[PDB]
């Protein structure tokens, strides 16, 4: 089967360089042109570079020309993207993609994509989250349902994992996508809705694990008298 | 500089139905247009190239047409897997992509349940204050949250995050967080989050006073 395997993602400081790799299997790599394309939720998909059959035959988007270099090692079936002078704006998911490569006369279309490597360009230091309760109240219950949660604030880098009652409570849990704050740190909330009657008699604990910092927290969330 | 514009931004359909998607170019790209599907947390998948050609193994239920500046993808007999984002791409001049069309599952309107959370004593003790407004299990996806501090409409001090459409009930949930410094927070008395949504006849406001709940 056709396969494109990308290097694992991580953090790199502004100004520094980073080389991504993508290794092909299950087809004759030498017979295909290859591309790098990146994606952000804010700016969408952006093509970056192409390398054709001959390893010296390359093109680049105006945005990265002279900063990025694409290359290929056919003996190792590997495609590289060398990124230099990185800026925070280069933070993105980076995909390698195979060109359709003249099969059925077509070219400059991406017929197979890797899963992507997430590159975070940031000067932030590794930091564990502060966890704060989002307390429920009998005042705030809507139609017999109460909401409670934990705010997981000021951590770096992504990701954090949140569970409730060690994984025992899954129904009605929503853990929101993280947002990057002006500080360069991330924040998210995890919430759960429960029957308003269970507030006094049921214990609710949010378990936050931040593996990039190897950090763990168990936080009991209790009702307030409002 | 060649721009591709996709429409509709969002399409709400049910499995078994037909979706019609459009891509318009700022100037002619001849037939140099492709369509991709991207399922959440996965790699894009090439559907159509040269405006109307199906990629190897792509079912005929994906059908592309058009030329010049006007293009269409139709997807017949929608499958559960098809609810995803679709992008167009041109290769007439360099390579650019449209901004995507989102295909989601239609269901009946459900108004959000709205909850407001004052900052904890612990957080305030740390020097900042986050006020969290939660809108739970609503449909459709469009919802608006307006913060008011002592009744004054707010701008620029909040961040919003929405879940993916829920597998179980096809609803969405949303968190909107107002972040203030501790002193700034302590300078105002009434905090309120005002919610508008299709399922609500008039806006819903949840509020609290500083130091209370």
């Amino acid at each position: 089967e056709v396969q494109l395997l990308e290097s694992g993602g991580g953090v790199v400081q502004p100004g520094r360089s980073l080389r991504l790799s993508c290794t092909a299997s299950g087809f004759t790599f030498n017979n295909y042109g290859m591309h790098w394309v990146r994606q952000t939720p804010g700016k969408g998909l952006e093509w970056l570079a192409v390398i054709w059959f001959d390893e010296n035959n390359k093109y680049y988007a105006d945005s990265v020309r002279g900063r990025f270099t694409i290359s290929r090692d056919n003996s190792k079936n590997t495609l590289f993207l060398q990124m230099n002078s990185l800026k925070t704006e280069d933070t993105a998911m980076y995909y390698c993609a195979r060109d359709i490569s003249l099969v059925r006369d077509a070219f400059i279309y991406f017929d197979f994509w890797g899963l992507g490597t997430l590159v975070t360009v940031s000067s932030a230091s590794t930091k564990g989250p502060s966890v704060f309760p989002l307390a429920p109240s009998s005042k705030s219950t809507s139609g017999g349902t109460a909401a409670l949660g934990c705010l997981v604030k000021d951590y770096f880098p992504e990701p954090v994992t949140v569970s409730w009652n060690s994984g025992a409570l899954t129904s009605g849990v929503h853990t929101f996508p993280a947002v990057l704050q002006s500080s360069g740190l991330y924040s998210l909330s995890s919430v759960v809705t429960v029957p308003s009657s269970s507030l006094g008699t049921q214990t609710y604990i949010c378990n936050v694990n931040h593996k990039p910092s190897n950090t763990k927290v168990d936080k009991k969330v209790e009702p307030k008298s409002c | 500089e060649l721009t591709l514009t996709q429409s509709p931004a969002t399409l709400s359909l049910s499995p078994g139905e037909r979706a019609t998607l459009s891509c318009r170019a700022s100037q002619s790209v001849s037939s140099y247009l492709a369509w991709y599907q991207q399922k959440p947390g996965q790699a894009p998948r090439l559907l159509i190239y040269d405006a109307s050609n199906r990629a190897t193994g792509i079912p005929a239920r994906f059908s592309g047409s058009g030329s010049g500046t006007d293009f269409t993808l139709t997807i017949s007999s929608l499958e559960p897997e098809d609810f995803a984002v679709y992008y167009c791409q041109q290769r007439s001049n360099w390579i650019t992509f449209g901004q995507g069309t989102r295909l989601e599952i239609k269901r009946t309107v459900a108004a959000p349940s709205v909850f407001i959370f004052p900052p904890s004593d612990e957080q305030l003790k740390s020097g900042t204050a986050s006020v969290v407004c939660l809108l739970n299990n609503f449909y459709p996806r469009e919802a608006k949250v307006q913060w008011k501090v002592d009744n004054a409409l707010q701008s620029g001090n909040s961040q919003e995050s929405v879940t993916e459409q829920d597998s179980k009930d096809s609803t969405y949930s949303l968190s909107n967080t107002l972040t203030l410094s501790k002193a700034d927070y302590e300078k105002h008395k009434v905090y309120a989050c005002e919610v508008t949504h299709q399922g609500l006849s008039s806006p819903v406001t949840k509020s609290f006073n500083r130091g209370e709940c």
Partner: peptide, 13 residues
């Protein structure tokens, strides 16, 4: 073969 880009336009030789 060879991929040619001429002011944005793609060609094959």
């Amino acid at each position: 073969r060879q991929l040619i880009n001429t002011n944005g336009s793609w060609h094959i030789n």
